[PDB]
Structures are given as structure tokens and as C-alpha cells.
């Protein structure tokens, strides 16, 4: 009654086992408001002398 039960499958040719679990959560939000204002004017001084 001791736990030195290494009578089968002695793998100590080092055998480094890894694990790498990885989760990720991500939300996002935007609010993009523009507002234009624009006005024009001109003048059209024309002439013709037939």
C-alpha cells in the first residue's frame, strides 16, 4: 500500500505534454453622424452685339 505503481508504460523519455486552451469575446459599437451645410451664388453678365 504505496503508490509506486510504475510497472507498466514507463515513459520518462521526457515526453512533455502541453495543452493550450484559449477563448475570446469581443463586441464593438459605432455612431457616426455628419451634417453638411452649403449654399452658392453667381452672376451672369452676358452680352452680344450682332
Amino acid at each position: 500500500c504505496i503508490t509506486h505503481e510504475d510497472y507498466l508504460n514507463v515513459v520518462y523519455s521526457s515526453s512533455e505534454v502541453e495543452k493550450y486552451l484559449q477563448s475570446q469575446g469581443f463586441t464593438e459599437h459605432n455612431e457616426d453622424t455628419t451634417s453638411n451645410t452649403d449654399e452658392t451664388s453667381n452672376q451672369n453678365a452676358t452680352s452680344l452685339d450682332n
Binding site: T37, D38, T40, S41, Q43, N44, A45, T46, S47
Partner: peptide, 21 residues
């Protein structure tokens, strides 16, 4: 010019201001 020989001359002046913001 025909074969009287009408002649014309024209001028236009066109400013156009603008702005936007």
C-alpha cells in the same frame, strides 16, 4: 461674310461664389 457680311461680338461675365461647412 456672304458672296451683307454680318458681324457679332459677345461678352459674358459669370462669377459664382460658394461655401460649405
Amino acid at each position: 461674310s456672304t458672296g451683307n457680311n454680318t458681324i457679332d461680338n459677345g461678352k459674358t461675365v459669370n462669377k459664382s461664389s460658394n461655401e460649405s461647412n
